Amino acid sequence: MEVCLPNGHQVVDLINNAFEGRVSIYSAQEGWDKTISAQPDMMVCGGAVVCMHCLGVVGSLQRKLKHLPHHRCNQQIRHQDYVDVQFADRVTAHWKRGMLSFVAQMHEMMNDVSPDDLDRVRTEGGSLVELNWLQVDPNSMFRSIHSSWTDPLQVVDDLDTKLDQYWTALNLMIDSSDLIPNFMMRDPSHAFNGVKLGGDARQTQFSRTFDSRSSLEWGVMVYDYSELEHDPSKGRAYRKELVTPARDFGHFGLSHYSRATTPILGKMPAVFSGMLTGNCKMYPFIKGTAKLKTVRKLVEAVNHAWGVEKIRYALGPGGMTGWYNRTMQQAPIVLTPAALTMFPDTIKFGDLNYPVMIGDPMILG
């Protein structure tokens, strides 16, 4: 059968899904389970199922395909023409799992704090929990020289539900005791340009995305609150008044503002939507325009493999090149989760008072 190209809205859905690590990929070898890496034969783009060898729509999501339908496939789309999407998706999937293990580790330590110690830190201030950074997602592509993005994805059922449950529990504990985490940012753009970098972290090269061009293996980055801990003029009352998150972000249970983390994994801050939005969803702090670039080579391949009339029929005015240029302009809206535009605007403490280092995530009073 002859097939048609997907429409622009379907490609936008593909891109947005890749940056949540939720693209549904089918490979002959693994079926629809992408736990084990394999070259994609089909990808779900919005409501369509698309053949990755011609970029033709071969079915719908509602039809539940279990094989690649026979069709007249031009076979012009090469793996290299869409691997940037596969890469962004798989790396985001690994990154979300790593971030979950980290948030869960912090939650567990906080949950194990004895009442006496909590009571003491609330009163006199002081360290409450510290996580050896070498214990954060150790065997991942972000921390081990022996791992790669093509490694298997850790099997985690209900990933987003878990991320929501743990982040919510962790922040409510922080909020109720006016505690201080060193792994949060009021505006993650400051991680890329703004914060002072200390020690080994001064060498950090931020790509501000998930692509194959540069190194995603790096240390765990957090704030160095060493000076705050020992400043005799900035004790517990000072910390409660200005430093605890609620002062800048609003009380967690009564705020729509997003809370971002420092670059814990992949040199990429995570952004969590606020509790009042109804869920604490987690997204990588990547610009919409950077996400759109993942299909730049695919647009070139489509332009070379498909006739101009067929491209217009599916993508509209100006074809796929036109769709791409229009989307680049609309990216701040159509390729950007609301959470990424909901950081606090009235700051009292902020992100520029202490440097960021490669080191242990911690919570103090």
Q: Which residues here bind Zn ion, judged by CB under 5 A? A: 51, 53-54, 56, 73
The full DSSP string for 337-349 is: -GGGG---SS-SS
- CB closer to a copy of itself, 2 vs 157: 2
Q: Binding residue for a copy of itself (CB under 8 A) from 101, 127, 204, 277?
A: 277
Is 223 in contact with 149 (CB distance < 8 Å)? no
Q: Which partner in a copy of itself, Zn ion, none is near 233 (CB below 5 to 8 A by kind)?
A: none
Give the burial class of 273: count Cβ atoms within 10 A of its Cβ; 0-12 exposed, 13-18 middle, 19 or more buried: buried
- CB closer to Zn ion, 254 vs 338: 254
Q: How far is the CB of 75 from Zn ion (least distance, A)?
A: 7
The full DSSP string for 63-92 is: G---S-----------GGGTHHHHHHHHHH
Is 154 in contact with 216 (CB distance < 8 Å)? no
How many CA atoms lie within 13 Å of 24's alpha carbon, on the beta-carbon side? Answer: 15
- CB closer to a copy of itself, 36 vs 276: 276
* 330 part of the interface to a copy of itself, by CB under 8 A: yes
Helix (H) or strand (E) holding 185: strand 184-185
Q: Which partner in a copy of itself, Zn ion, none is near 73 (CB below 5 to 8 A by kind)?
A: Zn ion
As a whole number of angstroms, the distance between CA 279 and CA 300 comes to 38
* 209 part of the interface to a copy of itself, by CB under 8 A: no
- Is the dihedral angle over the CA atoms 69, 74, 75, 81 positive or is it negative? negative
Q: Which of residues 49-68 bind a copy of itself (CB under 8 A)?
A: 57, 60-62
As a whole number of angstroms, the distance between CA 237 and CA 123 comes to 9
Q: Which stretch binds a copy of itself (CB under 8 A): 21-29, 43-51, 66-74, 148-156?
A: 43-51
Q: Which partner in Zn ion, a copy of itself, none is near 222 (CB below 5 to 8 A by kind)?
A: none
Q: How far is the CB of 2 from Zn ion (least distance, A)?
A: 11
* 74 part of the interface to a copy of itself, by CB under 8 A: no
Binding residues for a copy of itself, rule: CB under 8 A, are 2, 4, 6-7, 9-10, 46-48, 57, 60-62, 164, 250, 254-256, 275-279, 313-314, 316-317, 330, 333-334, 338, 342, 345
